[PDB]
């Protein structure tokens, strides 16, 4: 329902400090929208900086910071580096669901595995089953997401499964279409597809979460092209 909004692009140099920011349409963005930072390379490489507003995941750099200002979540990079050039994503988390901003395309002048197929061909009206197998962390320790991204538009959050309890939560827009299930004896997530349209092709990504720490490590996606 709610609108997310980023900067279209930025330019910076090395050795410079960036600032992106990130703005809720229903109002300021408060540390109950648990704020994502996730930074896209091509070939579909999505990692996560930063979760919950401010807490850096282990392993990023330290010149990624996460913070508050004004209305606005913001991501701050002091020292930006050339491997900074990228497109960088914010989400934001309306009581039972997650929104994404449209990116922002930064500019620079001058273990844990998550493998998804990486594209299906299907007839419309068909079913399919989605697969993301995990390995490098111990699989029932985190939930799974499941993101969709359909050519020219963004990214869009389609669910999420804890795979202990099996708990499962869902995309209003998704409920009729998506179902999240798991099999622990091989460390796989799967999302299975009914009674595809045209509508449905996009790039389905599975990214890795637990609570209050959402979106470190992605799949490189699923492409799935529906037509007859």
């Known amino acids: 329902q709610a609108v997310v909004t980023q900067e279209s692009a930025l330019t910076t140099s090395p050795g410079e400090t960036v600032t992106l920011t990130c703005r809720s349409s229903?109002?300021?963005?408060?540390?109950?929208?648990?704020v994502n930072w996730v930074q896209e390379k091509p070939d579909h490489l999505f990692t996560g900086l930063v979760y919950?507003?401010?807490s850096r995941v282990p392993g990023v750099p330290a010149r990624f910071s996460g913070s508050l200002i004004g209305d606005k979540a913001a991501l701050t990079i002091t020292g930006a580096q050339a491997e900074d050039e990228a497109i960088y994503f914010c989400?934001?988390?309306?009581?039972?669901?997650?929104?994404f901003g449209g990116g922002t395309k930064l500019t620079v002048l001058g273990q844990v595995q998550l493998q998804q197929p990486g594209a299906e061909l299907v007839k419309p009206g068909a079913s399919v089953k989605l697969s993301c197998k995990t390995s490098?962390?111990?699989?029932?320790?985190?939930?799974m997401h499941w993101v969709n991204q359909r050519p020219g538009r963004g990214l869009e959050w389609i669910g999420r499964?804890?795979?202990?309890?099996?708990?499962?939560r869902y995309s209003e827009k998704f409920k009729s279409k998506a179902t999240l299930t798991v099999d622990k004896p091989s460390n796989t997530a799967y999302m299975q597809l009914s009674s595809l349209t045209s509508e449905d092709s996009a790039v389905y990504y599975c990214?890795?979460?637990?609570?209050?720490?959402?979106?470190?490590?992605w799949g490189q996606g699923t492409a799935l092209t529906v037509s007859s």
């Open positions: 990214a890795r979460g637990k609570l209050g720490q959402h979106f470190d490590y």
């Open positions: 490098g962390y111990t699989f029932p320790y985190y939930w």
């Open positions: 499964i804890d795979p202990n309890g099996g708990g499962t």
């Open positions: 229903t109002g300021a963005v408060t540390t109950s929208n648990y």
């Open positions: 919950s507003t401010n």
């Open positions: 989400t934001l988390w309306y009581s039972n669901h997650w929104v």
